[PDB]
Amino acid sequence: HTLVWGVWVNGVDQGDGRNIYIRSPPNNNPVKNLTSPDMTCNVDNRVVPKSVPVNAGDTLTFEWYHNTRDDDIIASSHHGPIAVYIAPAASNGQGNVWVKLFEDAYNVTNSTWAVDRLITAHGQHSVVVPHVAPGDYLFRAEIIALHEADSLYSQNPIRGAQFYISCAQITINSSDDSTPLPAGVPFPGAYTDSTPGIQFNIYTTPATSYVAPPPSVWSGALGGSIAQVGDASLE
Numbered sequence: 001h002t003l004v005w006g007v008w009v010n011g012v013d014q015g016d017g018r019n020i021y022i023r024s025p026p027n028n029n030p031v032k033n034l035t036s037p038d039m040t041c042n043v044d045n046r047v048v049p050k051s052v053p054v055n056a057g058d059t060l061t062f063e064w065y066h067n068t069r070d071d072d073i074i075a076s077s078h079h080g081p082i083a084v085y086i087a088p089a090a091s092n093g094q095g096n097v098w099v100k101l102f103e104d105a106y107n108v109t110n111s112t113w114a115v116d117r118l119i120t121a122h123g124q125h126s127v128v129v130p131h132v133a134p135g136d137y138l139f140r141a142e143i144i145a146l147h148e149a150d151s152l153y154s155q156n157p158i159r160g161a162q163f164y165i166s167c168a169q170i171t172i173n174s175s176d177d178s179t180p181l182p183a184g185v186p187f188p189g190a191y192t193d194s195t196p197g198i199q200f201n202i203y204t205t206p207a208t209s210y211v212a213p214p215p216s217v218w219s220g221a222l223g224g225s226i227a228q229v230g231d232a233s234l235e
């Protein structure tokens with residue numbers, strides 16, 4: 001159970017984004033139905049009134065929280081991976097539009113899932129904004145909690161992988177557009193019951209064998225990290 005509070009740009013807090021530049025759902029409940037339109041941008045997908053300005057090469061940091069800002073972030077039990085996608089905003093997330101910018105699953109050295117490291121980062125994970133055409137975009141941050149992923153939702157509706165999905169409205173102002181955005185994958189549609197990473201037993205299969213759902217990260221992606229960039233308690 002987790003939600004996005006807002007974003008930072010180049011280490012500068014852009015302020016509470018909930019229902020303002022984030023298409024926030026009404027609460028922190030997971031999405032589980034892999035075919036639902038809720039997979040796109042969660043259960044309340046509509047245009048919200050603001051879009052955060054960035055330039056190509058900027059560091060965009062999502063900040064998650066559980067009940068209040070900068071709390072325990074997400075329950076520890078919720079091991080799993082974190083991804084970020086982008087699409088043109090005009091799509092409203094419909095069609096084959098989502099392009100992956102970031103994936104982090106399990107880090108062998110540190111022995112930590114992305115979710116574990118997100119807790120230690122105070123809810124903060126980042127991407128560098130790619131060199132796409134200036135204009136309005138949706139960045140879709142997705143946490144997959146795997147604590148009940150040994151079943152499939154479609155077979156047992158009281159279990160299954162959980163998806164915590166947040167869409168931010170981002171406007172890209174300066175960019176030389178050297179890597180125009182390709183077509184991507186649909187959500188819903190990209191993850192099915194047989195997609196690697198959806199059904200997985202984290203209790204008996206070792207984490208080093210986990211493979212995160214495709215698609216793979218776009219070559220035009222500029223990386224990203226899970227790490228605190230700003231101190232919320234100072235605001």
Ligand SMILES: OC[C@H]1O[C@@H](O[C@H]2[C@H](O)[C@@H](O)[C@H](O[C@H]3[C@H](O)[C@@H](O)[C@H](O[C@H]4[C@H](O)[C@@H](O)[C@H](O[C@H]5[C@H](O)[C@@H](O)[C@H](O)O[C@@H]5CO)O[C@@H]4CO)O[C@@H]3CO)O[C@@H]2CO)[C@H](O)[C@@H](O)[C@@H]1O
Nearest residue numbers: 001028066067074075076077078147148150151201203204
């Ligand atoms: O099957 C394989 C494997 O199972 C192992 O045991 C697992 C078990 O399978 C899981 O089902 C169990 O799942 C529990 C989670 O660990 C726990 O984090 C989660 O807690 C939820 C709670 O269910 C939910 O109601 C609560 O909602 C509140 C929000 O958090 C608040 O923000 C909001 O304001 O209010 C709502 C409503 O109160 O959220 C929390 C998370 O925050 O509950 C899960 C379901 O019970 O985990 C077990 C491991 O921890 C087993 O060990 C192995 O033997 C076996 O192979």
Ligand SMILES: *[C@@H]1O[C@H](CO)[C@@H](O)[C@H](O)[C@H]1NC(C)=O
Nearest residue numbers: 033034035036037153154157
């Ligand atoms: C999953 O979502 C689809 C598409 O909206 C819906 O029709 C189907 O009934 C849902 N399944 C459950 C168990 O709610």
Ligand SMILES: [Cl-]
Nearest residue numbers: 001030147162
């Ligand atoms: Cl749960």
Ligand SMILES: [Cl-]
Nearest residue numbers: 005067068069
């Ligand atoms: Cl708050």
Ligand SMILES: [Cl-]
Nearest residue numbers: 001066074075
């Ligand atoms: Cl809890």
Ligand SMILES: [Cu+2]
Nearest residue numbers: 001002075078
């Ligand atoms: Cu939860």
Ligand code: NA
Nearest residue numbers: 013014015052
């Ligand atoms: Na402002």
